[PDB]
Coordinates of C-alpha atoms and ligand atoms in Angstrom, one line a residue:
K1 CA 6.7 6.7 -0.3
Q2 CA 5.9 3.1 -2.4
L3 CA 2.7 1.3 -0.8
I4 CA 3.5 -2.4 -1.0
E5 CA 3.5 -4.0 -3.8
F6 CA 0.4 -7.3 -4.1
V7 CA -1.6 -8.3 -7.4
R8 CA -4.5 -6.3 -8.8
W9 CA -8.1 -7.9 -9.5
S10 CA -8.6 -6.4 -13.2
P11 CA -10.4 -2.8 -13.5
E12 CA -13.6 -4.7 -14.6
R13 CA -13.5 -6.9 -11.5
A14 CA -13.6 -3.7 -9.3
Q15 CA -15.8 -1.8 -11.4
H16 CA -18.5 -5.0 -10.8
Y17 CA -17.0 -5.4 -6.7
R18 CA -18.0 -1.5 -6.2
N19 CA -21.1 -1.7 -8.9
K20 CA -22.8 -4.4 -6.4
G21 CA -21.9 -2.9 -3.2
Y22 CA -19.5 -4.9 -2.2
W23 CA -15.9 -3.2 -2.2
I24 CA -16.9 0.3 0.0
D25 CA -13.8 2.4 -0.4
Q26 CA -13.0 2.6 3.5
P27 CA -10.9 1.7 5.5
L28 CA -10.8 -1.0 8.3
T29 CA -11.0 1.4 10.9
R30 CA -15.0 2.1 9.2
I31 CA -15.9 -0.9 12.3
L32 CA -14.0 1.6 15.1
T33 CA -15.8 5.2 13.5
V34 CA -19.0 3.9 13.3
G35 CA -19.1 1.8 16.1
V36 CA -18.4 5.2 17.7
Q37 CA -21.0 7.5 16.5
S38 CA -23.8 5.1 17.4
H39 CA -23.4 3.2 20.8
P40 CA -19.2 5.1 22.0
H41 CA -19.8 2.8 25.9
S42 CA -20.9 0.3 24.8
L43 CA -18.5 -3.0 25.7
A44 CA -16.2 -4.3 22.6
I45 CA -13.5 -6.3 24.7
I46 CA -14.1 -8.1 28.1
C47 CA -10.6 -9.7 28.8
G48 CA -10.5 -11.6 32.5
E49 CA -11.3 -8.6 34.6
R50 CA -10.9 -5.4 31.6
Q51 CA -13.8 -4.3 29.5
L52 CA -13.0 -2.3 27.3
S53 CA -15.7 0.3 25.6
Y54 CA -15.5 1.5 21.5
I55 CA -14.9 4.4 22.3
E56 CA -11.8 2.9 24.9
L57 CA -10.9 1.1 22.3
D58 CA -10.7 3.9 19.0
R59 CA -8.9 6.7 21.7
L60 CA -6.4 3.8 23.2
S61 CA -5.5 2.4 19.5
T62 CA -5.7 6.2 18.4
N63 CA -2.9 6.9 20.5
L64 CA 0.0 3.8 19.9
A65 CA -0.8 5.4 16.2
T66 CA 0.3 8.9 16.8
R67 CA 3.2 7.4 18.6
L68 CA 4.2 6.3 16.2
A69 CA 3.8 7.7 13.3
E70 CA 5.7 10.6 15.6
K71 CA 9.1 8.0 14.7
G72 CA 7.3 8.0 11.2
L73 CA 6.7 5.0 10.7
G74 CA 4.1 5.4 8.2
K75 CA 2.9 5.2 5.0
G76 CA 5.0 2.3 2.9
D77 CA 6.7 1.4 5.9
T78 CA 5.5 -3.0 7.4
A79 CA 5.4 -3.7 10.7
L80 CA 5.3 -8.0 13.0
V81 CA 3.3 -8.3 16.2
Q82 CA 3.1 -10.8 17.9
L83 CA 0.4 -11.0 20.6
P84 CA -1.3 -13.8 22.7
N85 CA -5.1 -13.6 22.8
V86 CA -5.2 -10.1 25.2
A87 CA -7.2 -6.6 24.4
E88 CA -3.6 -5.3 23.5
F89 CA -3.8 -7.2 20.3
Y90 CA -6.8 -5.7 18.6
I91 CA -5.8 -1.9 19.8
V92 CA -2.2 -2.4 18.3
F93 CA -4.2 -4.0 15.1
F94 CA -6.7 -1.0 14.8
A95 CA -3.8 1.3 15.3
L96 CA -1.9 0.1 12.3
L97 CA -4.3 0.4 10.9
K98 CA -4.5 4.0 11.2
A99 CA -1.2 4.5 10.9
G100 CA -0.8 3.7 7.2
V101 CA 1.4 0.7 8.7
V102 CA 0.6 -3.2 6.8
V103 CA 0.4 -5.7 9.5
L104 CA 1.5 -9.2 9.0
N105 CA 0.2 -10.5 12.9
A106 CA 2.4 -14.1 13.6
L107 CA 0.5 -17.1 15.5
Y108 CA 1.6 -16.6 19.1
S109 CA 2.7 -20.4 18.7
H110 CA 4.9 -19.9 15.5
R111 CA 9.0 -19.9 17.0
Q112 CA 12.3 -18.2 15.9
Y113 CA 11.9 -19.9 12.6
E114 CA 8.6 -18.5 11.2
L115 CA 9.6 -14.8 12.5
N116 CA 12.6 -15.0 11.5
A117 CA 11.3 -15.0 7.1
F118 CA 8.6 -12.9 8.1
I119 CA 10.7 -11.0 9.4
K120 CA 13.4 -11.3 5.9
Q121 CA 10.0 -11.6 3.6
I122 CA 8.7 -8.1 4.9
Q123 CA 11.9 -6.3 6.7
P124 CA 9.6 -4.4 8.9
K125 CA 10.3 -0.9 10.6
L126 CA 8.0 -1.8 14.1
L127 CA 8.0 -5.5 16.3
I128 CA 5.9 -6.3 19.1
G129 CA 6.2 -8.9 21.3
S130 CA 6.0 -10.9 24.3
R131 CA 8.8 -11.2 26.8
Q132 CA 6.9 -13.9 27.9
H133 CA 6.8 -15.9 24.6
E134 CA 10.1 -18.1 24.2
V135 CA 11.8 -16.3 21.5
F136 CA 11.8 -13.2 23.1
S137 CA 12.9 -15.0 26.8
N138 CA 16.6 -13.0 26.5
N139 CA 17.7 -11.1 23.5
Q140 CA 19.5 -13.7 21.1
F141 CA 16.7 -13.5 18.0
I142 CA 17.1 -9.9 18.7
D143 CA 20.5 -9.0 18.7
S144 CA 20.6 -12.5 16.0
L145 CA 19.0 -9.6 13.6
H146 CA 21.4 -6.9 14.3
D147 CA 24.3 -9.3 12.0
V148 CA 22.2 -9.5 8.8
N149 CA 20.8 -5.7 9.0
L150 CA 17.3 -6.8 9.5
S151 CA 17.2 -4.5 12.7
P152 CA 13.9 -2.6 13.1
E153 CA 13.4 1.1 13.8
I154 CA 11.2 0.0 16.8
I155 CA 10.9 -3.1 19.7
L156 CA 7.7 -3.3 21.3
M157 CA 7.4 -5.5 24.2
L158 CA 3.6 -6.5 25.9
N159 CA 5.5 -7.6 29.7
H160 CA 8.1 -5.5 29.0
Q161 CA 11.7 -4.8 30.7
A162 CA 13.4 -1.3 32.6
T163 CA 15.0 -1.2 29.9
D164 CA 12.4 -1.8 26.7
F165 CA 9.9 0.0 25.3
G166 CA 7.0 -1.1 26.5
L167 CA 3.9 -1.6 24.4
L168 CA 1.9 -0.4 27.7
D169 CA 3.4 3.2 27.7
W170 CA 2.9 3.6 24.1
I171 CA -0.5 2.6 24.1
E172 CA -2.2 4.8 27.5
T173 CA 0.0 8.2 27.0
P174 CA 0.4 10.0 23.8
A175 CA 3.3 11.2 21.7
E176 CA 4.3 14.8 22.4
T177 CA 4.5 16.6 19.4
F178 CA 2.0 15.7 16.8
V179 CA 2.6 14.3 13.5
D180 CA 0.5 13.7 10.5
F181 CA -1.0 9.5 9.6
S182 CA -4.2 7.8 7.6
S183 CA -4.7 4.5 6.4
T184 CA -3.5 3.1 3.9
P185 CA -6.3 3.3 0.8
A186 CA -9.5 1.4 0.4
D187 CA -8.0 -0.4 -3.1
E188 CA -4.4 -0.6 -1.1
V189 CA -3.0 -3.8 1.0
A190 CA -4.0 -3.0 4.7
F191 CA -2.5 -5.9 6.1
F192 CA -0.8 -9.5 5.2
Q193 CA -3.1 -12.9 6.3
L194 CA -0.9 -16.1 6.5
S195 CA -1.6 -19.7 4.6
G196 CA -2.6 -22.1 6.9
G197 CA -1.7 -24.1 3.4
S198 CA 2.1 -24.6 3.1
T199 CA 4.4 -26.6 4.2
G200 CA 6.6 -25.9 6.6
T201 CA 7.1 -21.8 5.8
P202 CA 3.6 -20.2 6.1
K203 CA 3.0 -18.4 2.8
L204 CA 1.8 -13.9 2.7
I205 CA -1.9 -13.0 1.5
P206 CA -1.9 -9.3 1.0
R207 CA -5.6 -8.6 2.0
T208 CA -6.9 -4.8 0.8
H209 CA -9.4 -3.0 3.6
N210 CA -12.6 -3.1 0.6
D211 CA -12.3 -7.0 0.3
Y212 CA -11.6 -7.7 4.2
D213 CA -14.0 -5.2 4.7
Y214 CA -16.6 -6.5 2.6
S215 CA -15.7 -10.1 3.7
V216 CA -16.9 -9.1 7.2
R217 CA -20.0 -6.9 6.9
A218 CA -21.3 -10.0 4.8
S219 CA -20.0 -12.2 7.9
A220 CA -21.8 -10.4 10.1
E221 CA -25.0 -10.2 8.4
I222 CA -24.9 -14.4 7.3
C223 CA -24.4 -15.1 10.9
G224 CA -27.0 -12.4 12.3
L225 CA -24.4 -10.6 14.3
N226 CA -26.0 -8.2 16.7
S227 CA -24.8 -5.8 19.2
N228 CA -26.3 -8.4 21.9
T229 CA -23.1 -10.6 20.3
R230 CA -20.9 -11.3 22.8
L231 CA -18.8 -13.7 20.5
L232 CA -15.8 -16.0 22.6
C233 CA -12.3 -15.5 21.3
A234 CA -10.6 -19.3 22.3
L235 CA -8.7 -19.9 18.8
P236 CA -5.8 -18.0 18.1
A237 CA -6.9 -13.9 17.6
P238 CA -5.1 -13.4 14.3
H239 CA -6.0 -16.3 12.2
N240 CA -9.1 -15.8 9.6
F241 CA -11.9 -17.8 11.2
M242 CA -11.2 -16.3 14.2
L243 CA -10.5 -12.2 12.7
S244 CA -13.3 -12.4 10.5
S245 CA -15.6 -15.4 9.8
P246 CA -17.4 -13.9 11.2
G247 CA -14.5 -12.7 13.9
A248 CA -14.1 -10.3 16.2
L249 CA -14.2 -7.6 13.2
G250 CA -17.9 -9.1 12.2
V251 CA -19.2 -9.2 16.2
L252 CA -17.1 -5.6 16.3
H253 CA -19.0 -4.0 13.2
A254 CA -22.7 -5.2 14.3
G255 CA -21.8 -4.0 17.5
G256 CA -21.5 -6.5 20.2
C257 CA -18.8 -7.6 22.0
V258 CA -15.6 -10.3 21.8
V259 CA -14.6 -11.7 24.8
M260 CA -10.8 -12.9 25.6
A261 CA -10.2 -16.3 26.3
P262 CA -6.2 -17.6 26.4
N263 CA -6.9 -20.9 24.1
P264 CA -9.6 -23.6 23.6
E265 CA -9.6 -25.3 26.7
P266 CA -13.2 -26.4 28.3
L267 CA -13.0 -26.2 32.3
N268 CA -11.4 -22.4 31.5
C269 CA -13.7 -21.3 28.4
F270 CA -16.6 -22.7 30.3
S271 CA -16.1 -20.7 33.0
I272 CA -15.4 -17.5 31.1
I273 CA -19.7 -18.8 28.4
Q274 CA -20.5 -18.3 32.2
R275 CA -19.1 -15.2 33.6
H276 CA -20.0 -13.5 30.8
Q277 CA -23.0 -15.3 29.2
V278 CA -20.8 -15.5 25.8
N279 CA -23.6 -16.2 23.3
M280 CA -21.1 -17.1 20.4
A281 CA -18.1 -19.6 20.0
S282 CA -15.9 -20.5 17.1
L283 CA -13.9 -23.7 16.9
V284 CA -11.9 -25.8 15.3
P285 CA -13.2 -30.1 15.3
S286 CA -9.8 -30.9 17.9
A287 CA -11.6 -28.6 20.6
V288 CA -14.8 -30.0 19.1
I289 CA -13.7 -32.7 20.9
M290 CA -12.6 -32.0 24.0
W291 CA -15.7 -29.9 25.0
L292 CA -18.1 -32.0 23.9
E293 CA -15.9 -34.7 26.4
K294 CA -16.7 -32.0 29.7
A295 CA -20.2 -30.4 28.5
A296 CA -22.8 -32.9 30.2
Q297 CA -21.5 -32.0 34.0
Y298 CA -21.9 -28.8 32.7
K299 CA -24.5 -27.7 31.5
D300 CA -25.3 -25.6 33.5
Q301 CA -22.1 -22.8 32.6
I302 CA -22.5 -23.4 29.0
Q303 CA -26.1 -22.5 28.6
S304 CA -26.2 -19.0 27.6
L305 CA -24.3 -20.2 23.8
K306 CA -26.5 -20.3 21.4
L307 CA -23.9 -20.5 18.8
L308 CA -21.4 -22.4 17.4
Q309 CA -19.2 -22.0 14.3
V310 CA -16.9 -25.2 13.6
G311 CA -14.5 -24.9 10.7
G312 CA -10.6 -25.4 10.0
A313 CA -10.4 -29.0 9.4
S314 CA -12.2 -31.9 8.5
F315 CA -15.8 -32.4 10.3
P316 CA -17.4 -36.0 10.3
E317 CA -21.2 -35.8 10.6
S318 CA -21.3 -38.4 13.5
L319 CA -19.9 -35.0 15.8
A320 CA -21.9 -32.5 13.8
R321 CA -25.1 -34.3 15.5
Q322 CA -23.3 -34.2 19.0
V323 CA -23.1 -30.3 18.9
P324 CA -26.4 -29.5 19.4
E325 CA -27.8 -32.4 21.8
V326 CA -25.2 -32.0 24.0
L327 CA -23.3 -28.6 23.7
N328 CA -27.3 -26.9 23.6
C329 CA -26.9 -24.5 20.7
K330 CA -27.2 -24.0 17.0
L331 CA -24.3 -25.4 14.2
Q332 CA -22.7 -23.4 12.4
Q333 CA -20.6 -25.0 9.7
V334 CA -17.1 -22.7 8.1
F335 CA -15.1 -23.7 5.0
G336 CA -13.0 -20.8 4.6
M337 CA -9.1 -20.2 3.7
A338 CA -6.8 -17.0 4.6
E339 CA -6.7 -16.4 1.0
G340 CA -10.3 -15.3 0.2
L341 CA -13.5 -17.7 -0.4
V342 CA -15.5 -18.2 3.2
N343 CA -18.3 -21.1 3.0
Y344 CA -21.2 -20.6 5.9
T345 CA -24.2 -23.4 6.7
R346 CA -27.3 -20.6 7.1
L347 CA -29.6 -20.0 9.4
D348 CA -32.1 -20.8 7.8
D349 CA -30.6 -23.9 6.0
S350 CA -32.3 -27.5 7.3
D351 CA -30.5 -30.5 9.8
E352 CA -29.3 -32.0 7.7
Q353 CA -27.9 -29.4 5.4
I354 CA -26.5 -28.0 8.4
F355 CA -24.9 -31.5 10.0
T356 CA -24.2 -33.1 6.5
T357 CA -22.1 -29.8 4.6
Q358 CA -19.2 -27.2 4.9
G359 CA -22.2 -24.2 3.3
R360 CA -21.7 -21.9 0.5
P361 CA -20.0 -19.3 -0.2
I362 CA -20.4 -15.2 0.9
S363 CA -21.2 -13.5 -2.1
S364 CA -23.6 -14.2 -5.4
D365 CA -19.6 -13.2 -6.8
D366 CA -17.7 -15.6 -5.2
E367 CA -16.9 -18.2 -8.7
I368 CA -16.7 -21.4 -8.3
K369 CA -14.7 -24.3 -10.4
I370 CA -14.8 -27.6 -10.1
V371 CA -12.7 -29.7 -11.6
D372 CA -10.6 -33.1 -12.9
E373 CA -6.8 -34.4 -13.4
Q374 CA -7.1 -32.6 -16.7
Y375 CA -8.8 -28.9 -15.8
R376 CA -12.2 -29.5 -16.8
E377 CA -14.8 -29.0 -14.8
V378 CA -16.8 -32.2 -14.1
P379 CA -20.2 -33.5 -14.0
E380 CA -22.6 -31.8 -11.0
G381 CA -21.9 -33.5 -7.8
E382 CA -19.2 -35.5 -8.2
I383 CA -15.6 -34.7 -6.3
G384 CA -13.3 -32.6 -7.8
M385 CA -10.4 -29.9 -7.0
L386 CA -12.0 -25.8 -6.1
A387 CA -11.1 -23.6 -7.9
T388 CA -12.6 -19.9 -7.5
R389 CA -12.5 -15.8 -7.5
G390 CA -14.5 -13.1 -6.0
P391 CA -14.9 -9.7 -4.7
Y392 CA -12.5 -10.6 -1.5
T393 CA -10.1 -13.6 -2.4
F394 CA -6.0 -12.7 -3.1
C395 CA -4.0 -12.5 -6.6
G396 CA -1.8 -13.8 -5.9
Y397 CA 0.8 -13.7 -2.8
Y398 CA 3.3 -11.9 -1.6
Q399 CA 6.3 -11.5 -3.9
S400 CA 6.6 -15.0 -5.5
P401 CA 5.6 -14.8 -9.2
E402 CA 6.5 -18.3 -9.4
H403 CA 4.4 -19.4 -6.8
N404 CA 1.6 -17.8 -7.9
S405 CA 1.7 -19.2 -11.9
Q406 CA 1.0 -22.0 -10.0
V407 CA -1.3 -22.3 -8.2
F408 CA -3.9 -19.8 -10.5
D409 CA -5.1 -20.4 -14.0
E410 CA -5.2 -18.4 -17.1
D411 CA -8.7 -17.1 -16.4
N412 CA -7.5 -15.8 -12.4
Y413 CA -9.4 -18.3 -10.5
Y414 CA -7.1 -19.8 -7.2
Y415 CA -6.6 -23.1 -6.7
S416 CA -6.7 -24.5 -2.6
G417 CA -6.1 -27.9 -3.2
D418 CA -9.6 -28.7 -1.5
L419 CA -11.8 -31.3 -3.2
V420 CA -15.0 -30.9 -2.5
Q421 CA -18.3 -31.4 -4.5
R422 CA -21.6 -29.7 -5.0
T423 CA -24.7 -31.1 -3.3
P424 CA -27.7 -30.9 -4.6
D425 CA -29.5 -27.9 -2.8
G426 CA -26.2 -25.7 -3.7
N427 CA -24.0 -26.2 -0.4
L428 CA -20.1 -27.7 -0.6
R429 CA -19.3 -30.3 0.9
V430 CA -15.2 -30.6 1.2
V431 CA -13.5 -34.8 1.6
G432 CA -10.5 -34.0 0.1
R433 CA -7.3 -31.9 -0.2
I434 CA -4.4 -32.9 -3.0
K435 CA -0.6 -31.4 -3.8
Ligands
HP8_1 N1 -14.7 -27.2 7.2 C1 -13.8 -27.7 6.8 N2 -13.6 -28.4 6.8 C2 -12.6 -28.9 6.3 N3 -11.5 -28.5 5.9 C3 -11.6 -27.7 5.5 C4 -13.0 -26.5 6.8 N4 -12.3 -25.1 6.9 C5 -11.3 -25.0 6.5 N5 -10.5 -25.8 6.0 C6 -9.5 -26.5 5.5 O1 -8.3 -24.7 5.3 C7 -7.8 -24.2 4.4 C8 -7.9 -23.2 5.3 O2 -7.0 -22.8 6.4 S1 -6.6 -21.9 6.7 O3 -6.2 -21.1 7.9 O4 -6.2 -20.9 5.9 N6 -8.3 -21.1 7.2 C9 -9.3 -20.9 7.8 O5 -9.0 -22.7 8.1 C10 -10.5 -21.2 7.9 C11 -11.5 -22.2 8.5 C12 -12.9 -21.3 8.4 C13 -12.9 -20.3 8.1 C14 -12.3 -20.0 7.8 O6 -12.3 -18.1 7.2 C15 -11.2 -20.3 6.9 O7 -10.0 -19.1 7.0 C16 -9.0 -24.8 3.6 O8 -8.4 -24.8 2.3 C17 -9.4 -26.1 4.3 O9 -8.4 -27.2 3.3
CA2 CA1 -12.9 0.9 30.4
CA3 CA1 -27.9 -22.6 24.7

């Protein structure tokens, strides 16, 4: 009965964000429902040989949701999902969104240590993972859970064993008895994002349907997504950048197709790009340099590529200028954070803007302060700490009133710890970090 707790925006702000049409009060599933009504047979996912259409994606994720409700998981429950870059990730994500189950999506690279702490924190009634992952190689982690009574009622395994509840069987066939389910309401938590800004253990970021959906819709527009967009998805699927900036979700919103890739390794990606005439990709700087090393020898395989976003870590101008000359596609720079705020260079910005800056916020209403060691705004152009609040920036980590009071100010701006400067045209330049 009790929905997951989070820190809310003020009602003044809630109202403003509905008034400007940012918050339209639909569930994240809107992406899918709308997609089914316009183009049920367009490709939504390409994963090696497989092709999932929008209605295939809608049907399969309905199956699993009915199947989970049958076992009485729904509004109030939480779930821990750990899945590699395969179509099942999205099927599952939609399933839980439809079910009303608030999900935390673990990175596949996360090991016992992190999975344990997430479990302790959100106490899932559902766990989903892969028998091919070192942690579910055998049973030591699962049995371990029994001994602290953090055992999930239900556990699904991809690449399951015979005595496992297989994920694929739960996706493939709908439940015998019909139980009722819906999404969490739109101004309540849809799921948990994770910070990359953390010492060791990632802090949990509640995101609501309203704020996430808005970030996705607005991002699709800033990047000019449309139904011909075919977006390579080589970064970890649950990462905010890859999910929503504009991400799988952005592409789904625009009626395009996501193209799966296990990781960002060049030869494998280059030839996934070739096979599916991928026209859009998203990478972090260390992966950009790998592609840069092999692109001249494979000019032919990667021509179809029209846009590459780079975000996630400092990106020297030196390398930025190489993207168009070497990768043969437009560059867009992205500076975002799981916590909220995302900045894009625009497609109509100048050469210099795009090579030397990390763009400007999604929303005219992303409010921004750049401040000095004593919390005063700095002179324009100077370097200070970024502080921000907006229509899609969280208002606290899950169940951490102590850390929250350290990283928010009286007026509810959030402090990322990034050192920025505003440029004379209006974009941001990420210059550093501070504790
Ligand atoms: N373009 C950038 N240049 C320099 N630093 C960056 C940049 N982008 C992110 N960072 C650092 O990474 C931190 C954010 O870490 S996260 O993992 O939460 N998210 C992302 O990384 C993320 C990147 C691009 C688009 C997105 O939507 C994202 O969510 C920021 O506080 C920055 O310190
Ligand atoms: Ca199909
Ligand atoms: Ca090209």
